[PDB]
Amino acid sequence: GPMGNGMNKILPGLYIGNFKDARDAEQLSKNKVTHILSVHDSARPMLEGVKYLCIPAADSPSQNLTRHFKESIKFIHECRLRGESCLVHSLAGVSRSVTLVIAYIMTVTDFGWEDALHTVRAGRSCANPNVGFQRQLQEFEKHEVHQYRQWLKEEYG
């Protein structure tokens, strides 16, 4: 459905869901979620037992998400390197959250944005960044992802 069917594993330690999934104690426990990247209109810390990164942002082509790629990647990566699990969520788990996860996948692989989107969709079929986020990801692939891959190597080996 258009808001998914529960949070979905994208890679080990990396999940995407909707806002309800992000407060679902059963889902959070089953998936061992200890970090939440919340990217939606009213993102703020809510639950106990969870490290948050909160990015108030709209699901619109006029919303800049590129300026949040680096902090999102650092947050996700440092969680995953410690063997912990991170949920990236938006309202629907379709666009804002998916875009940040695509940037992450592009940085930890050699993938362009389309192969990264394919990866996300294999785990969460409803993934579909808005057309503006798609263009931001294309620009990121063209001009900056190679700098991010080098930063990742320098900072984390």
Author numbering: -1 to 155
Study authors write:
DUSP22 is a small phosphatase containing 184 residues, and the sequence contains a catalytic domain as well as an N-terminal myristoylation site. This enzyme is broadly expressed in different tissues and plays important roles in the regulation of signaling pathways, such as inactivating the T cell receptor (TCR) signaling pathway, activating the JNK signaling pathway, and regulating the phosphorylation of focal adhesion kinase (FAK). The phosphatase domain of DUSP22 consists of five twisted β-sheets and six α-helices, and the structural scaffold is similar to that of DUSP3 (VHR), while DUSP22 does not contain an N-terminal α-helix surrounded by the N-loop. In this region, the catalytic activity is facilitated by C88 in the P-loop and D57 in the D-loop, and the hydrogen bonding network is formed by D57 in the D-loop, S93 in the P-loop, and N128 in the N-loop.
The S93 mutants were combined with a second mutation, C88S, to produce proteins for growing better crystals, which improved the resolution (<1.6 Å) and helped to determine the structures.
